[PDB]
Design a protein around this ligand. Structure first.
Ligand SMILES: Cc1ncc(COP(=O)(O)O)c(/C=N/NC(=O)CNC(=O)c2ccccc2C(F)(F)F)c1O
Ligand SMILES: Cc1ncc(COP(=O)(O)O)c(/C=N/NC(=O)CNC(=O)c2ccccc2C(F)(F)F)c1O
Ligand SMILES: Cc1ncc(COP(=O)(O)O)c(/C=N/NC(=O)CNC(=O)c2ccccc2C(F)(F)F)c1O
Ligand SMILES: Cc1ncc(COP(=O)(O)O)c(/C=N/NC(=O)CNC(=O)c2ccccc2C(F)(F)F)c1O
Lengths: 392, 392, 391, 391
């Protein structure tokens, strides 16, 4: 009943494993009906876990779906080729011309760009809010607000929402709004979005659930209210993921507890050490006091993953930036995160100000986003330490 | 320079094969930048075949993309999780509220349903045309017509468009329309859509390109005019396909010539034999005289694949339908087609009338859709022959 | 009916489970729901009940059923590559003091396994000319345990008179196990077990896979030999992974349309080469006049796309490079049986060193071709340009 | 630094090519752009230049580099499963007239390979008690070619005094090859090559893969033995597929966080069982009092999650079924080293039949547990309920 037991067993019914430990991998487009009667029975149950057509899924998808519903406490799981596909398509599934979308201004940039470049030309408007607005979100609601889009902690800058206050405020004014969250940082499990009255918990399963930086997949776990419309409207957009990726995602769940505990332990140690460092202005780790929304993190989360950022006292010029980033031995530059390896990315205040619509930034030094992987934490601190010496 | 040589070699540059015969399989979300300078160079070339992020693709995607552009004569290839995803997302990529979509009424049903259920609520209207309308398509154009959507031969009923006449008519009235085709029957190669002044040739690569009924993938090969907008707008919807599927698709190309010649030879023999059969009212095979648009097929296509249909003299009742379909030895019931195996599906006139908007059907008997696979053609004819005896 | 058999081979509902292709069951551990169930699996662990991944999953059982129906056998043993199937099939039947009799035209690693591994185990090997037929009795010892055939032969492509050899072997050493490396025929163009051969071995790597990207060996056995090969191979830990098994089953599906094209194209090239002024001889089983062509015509139901020819000259190293480095369509590589065309050269000296107890009978450079699925006239054009480089 | 090494092992840019993980290069044929290039690859075909798929691709070279750095070896030979690596590693070093000396606690198929395959090849095998240490000189013959260790032992979990055994072997038969099945330690909890062992073998199937869905064997060799094992294994056609190589490399990445959890959980279960009224003895290398625990504590840097214990009673078949059929979390299956927990029973008679030249010293039913990644208290609760079924 504990999470580690859940993780090992999630989705592993005999009807999916067929004698093996893991689900089978059923590769298929065509699924064969042995009779008119069977074909008619499959048609009736085509969105209900019966083999009907590859686009709806095979045993391998059904297994992952069951596992996701168990882990996040959902009525259904809808699958997508990547996180960005789960975001764009989850929002598209619930809107119509004349609707309003209200989204945190700390939302992953492609999530915002979907709203500003795709939704806008379909007669759907979007506005943005500061992630710490809490109960004052009422001020940003419109008569036509259909979706309220959360991301906690926020992309890059890591602000944690006061979800209880936000949800209560939204329900008080537009109770029939669809509230969605990009719950990728928490891996859907360190923060139980659906227990908080959120309708749809979306993940880039690409990150922690896969955990190895070698498959892409999006998930949206839905409450009972929202599942049908998300599923059927995403189907009309031909959204699916391949059977092999679904397998590898279920397989990822198996080590997610041991991995997250290590990401938590190590990232917190790095963040504490950064907080005491002379060259560091501020540390944005949700688990750390003085970080935005930390108190909501403590109250509402059961853990931390390994992604965070910190602000240098300096704003690095281009040469110092190259000097710092080019010469790391264990941290690599790359996008994505949630793998076994450590990563490093720089953002300048001007870059971040440009992706914070209807809001202001709160720092002026160069911002570094770290993913703390599974390497030895002291080796990692040594690498960060050598970096500091390169920009003193 | 012949198609078989093209097929063997398409996409197989050394930069993708790295010493092997086939492209490597590069599984990745994160792609690592070795320096700020490399990261900046990759950013600039991120839609241009340089490794940048898994969502844009890896070497394995780039190889398939190159192969598709070569085979269809396109400026670019955009990839999707399945055919239906390539259809919905190709159309979405070019529309805005207030636009009109004009689509053949013989379009695959999910293609129509995307228009009628998704587009309509985004302020985009759709109307339909008879596939043999040819130059008289002018009658259906509106000031706001943005897309004209073709499918030749048509789904199920197999009508071939007079593409030259349709294209010329559209260009005469709305020269800036986006003309698209679902070119899956031809596998993009028996009909060179882009040579015919079509802007986007879309395939369910799931069918012939894969050829084994075990992977799903959509492709849209674009002319230079349309590539950017399709690619960038599909990216904003997070559309991609996994590296393994891309590999398997490139691998499918290798035997597409030998497979199609066999599908052509065998299906034509079956269709000729059906045409002489007493229990058969009509045969809808594009390669066969008396079939709708056959003369356009002869003029414009370089071959036939293995999908066609025929109309029984009877309209089967439920019991005769079960008797017929339940008792085949080599034909199986399933959706999809374009694999190595033979398939059979029944449709009643009432079913087809319901998916032919703004048009009338032309038959009254039960319609049978056959996919002729790679089995021995005489074994296949024996199975069909036993079926006839079951419903005499 | 071969095309129909190929499409359906191994595709029982218990293996495909609603799909067209067999499922892919990746597993080491296989779970027993009860102690009874574990007893039942144990008693059936070599008889297609799930027991342990080393013995196989549904995916392996599917491929094994398919190979057995295609080659008309009692069982199909699986190996990580063709060379593993050859080495381990032979090992499974010998003991110290045995003798092995192998065609001198056998694939070199097959010969090497005998000369370098068996020899230190007290097993002797000697060799025969592939055209020996009934005169093979000459070479049969009272301790001859294995007679190992390869028809057509590696590189030089000589075809055995299998019926004559089998009759001779049975009359003198009935206890011998007769084996064939039947890869060139993809197991289906020559129905080895119907000719009285005990074990038909394939580098499934070749035409069965058909795409040059999976490695696997198979050994289809009659009922006389299946258990021994199966159990002794198992003691050596021989198996192949589930996904490779899947891909090999998948290969079968296009095997007919592929082999027909390899046949038609290779023979056209062969016929053109035979008439070429720069060509001494062509070694193609399907071509009239080739060594053993009479046996090919009688005993085979088709041809594949691998053959060789002898240049009138023996190329020197500069010529060799000018010829081979400058092809546009043919690539240099080992293996064959994929969709693409390949070229390799062997000098007569090289061949002389791998024909034990034999004598080479050509003096020009030998060129081995695999004719793939490219347009045949494009391929002839590429060879024509190669001839210009060496005139 | 093991966690850092695990994360990075084998991940050179030449293998990953811009990605985080190595590429997957599926290939049999590998193309030579020129005759020169083909010469160069040929001379380097065992030295990590692309030559033929049977020798490996980039993906195999990546895993081989990783195993070599993790176990401190000159080379890493790959096999389709652990049992293949054991059978073939031994074969690679013997000849007729040799003697093999193997722990009587060796995995049964390891013993069977010796008694059923080697014996008919003129190779003799005898066996020793795992706690023999320096007294192993007793068993060493002038023709002893292989000394084969397994520490901890299969099933009963006895830990060798490796330093004492190695010193004795070197003093008496310096030409002997000392081998270990080092799977329980995942190669990294016991640095076998640093103790003077020649070849460290793993069923990589176990902890390296870590998920019970890929099969593979590895044999990491010192410089003295690498070439022979490598070349002789190759003559047997031993290899593993590229995708399994990829997945094994991938396993390494979580190996540290996994092993630490298997250690912590298994030891807690062991400690609880040792104190249980229904339990006679617990066989866990990490538990004080277990056979060879002093050697585990001295020579190992950690523990994995596989161990066993002896019930006070010998269960009859009804009791066996009531105990084993009714678990909620532990499953019955062979293999171990995955994320899930497993249980198997062995009766003392069963064990007595696989301890050649040894004597069993327990009389109750022996229960082998693999402790996976589930919550340890859930697992203890499941065992507690099992005890209630048999009181
Ligand atoms: C909270 C969150 N939610 C969803 C996603 C998207 O997941 P996926 O599976 O689509 O990459 C992610 C993204 N991980 N990616 C990055 O940190 C890097 N992304 C970008 O720079 C980016 C920003 C905007 C457009 C594209 C990209 C691209 F580079 F292409 F990844 C995310 O962090
Ligand atoms: C011309 C054409 N174009 C695109 C597609 C879609 O490709 P994909 O890769 O998405 O299945 C296809 C479809 N192949 N599928 C069928 O013949 C069966 N499809 C349906 O019955 C169907 C109709 C409507 C909705 C779903 C389905 C579902 F069953 F789910 F396949 C097609 O024929
Ligand atoms: C009739 C026949 N039987 C078995 C095999 C071996 O099969 P596999 O799947 O092990 O490669 C094959 C071989 N494919 N190989 C070649 O054309 C060339 N191989 C060698 O000369 C060779 C022999 C020994 C070792 C390596 C090689 C290497 F060069 F790598 F190919 C074969 O032709
Ligand atoms: C120390 C050790 N060394 C090697 C192996 C074999 O590895 P692999 O990858 O070949 O399974 C293993 C084995 N895993 N197997 C088991 O716990 C049980 N296996 C057997 O008893 C057995 C022995 C011989 C043949 C089959 C089996 C089968 F039952 F199928 F598991 C091992 O424990």
């Amino acid at each position: 009943k504990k999470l580690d037991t859940q993780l090992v067993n999630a989705g592993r019914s005999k009807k999916y494993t067929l004698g093996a430990v893991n689900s089978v991998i059923q590769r298929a487009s065509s699924l064969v009906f042995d009779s008119v009667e069977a074909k008619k029975h499959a048609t009736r149950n085509r969105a209900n876990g019966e083999l009907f057509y590859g686009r709806r899924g095979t045993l391998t998808h059904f297994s992952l779906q069951q596992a996701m519903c168990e882990l996040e406490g959902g009525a259904g799981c809808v699958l997508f080729p990547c996180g960005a596909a789960a975001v764009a398509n989850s929002i598209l599934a619930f809107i119509e011309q004349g609707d309003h979308v209200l989204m945190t201004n700390t939302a992953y940039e492609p999530s915002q760009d979907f709203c500003s470049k795709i939704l806008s030309k379909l007669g759907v408007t979007t506005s943005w809010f500061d992630p710490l607005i809490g109960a004052d979100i009422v001020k940003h609601l419109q008569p036509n607000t259909k979706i309220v889009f959360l991301e906690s902690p926020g992309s890059i800058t890591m602000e944690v929402h006061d979800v209880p206050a936000i949800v209560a405020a939204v329900r008080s004014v537009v109770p029939d709004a669809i509230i969605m969250i990009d719950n990728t940082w928490a891996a859907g499990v360190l923060f139980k979005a659906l227990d908080f009255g959120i309708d749809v918990s979306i993940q880039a399963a690409t990150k922690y659930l896969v955990g190895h930086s070698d498959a892409m997949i999006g998930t949206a776990v839905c409450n009972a209210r929202c599942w049908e419309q998300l599923r059927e409207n995403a189907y009309l957009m031909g959204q699916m993921v391949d059977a092999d990726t679904a397998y590898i995602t279920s397989r990822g769940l198996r080590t997610l507890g041991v991995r997250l505990r290590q990401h938590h332990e190590s990232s917190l140690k790095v963040a504490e050490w950064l907080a005491e460092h002379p060259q560091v202005a501020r540390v944005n780790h949700p688990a750390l006091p003085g970080s935005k929304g930390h108190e909501f993190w403590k109250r509402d989360f059961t853990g931390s993953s390994g992604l965070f950022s910190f602000v240098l006292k300096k704003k690095l010029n281009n040469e110092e930036l190259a000097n710092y980033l080019d010469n790391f031995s264990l941290f690599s530059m790359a996008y994505s995160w949630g793998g076994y390896e450590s990563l490093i990315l720089a953002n300048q205040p001007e870059h971040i100000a440009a992706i914070r619509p209807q809001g202001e930034i709160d720092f002026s030094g160069t911002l570094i986003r770290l993913h703390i992987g599974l390497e030895d934490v002291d080796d990692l601190i040594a690498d960060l330490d050598a970096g500091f010496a390169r920009i003193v």
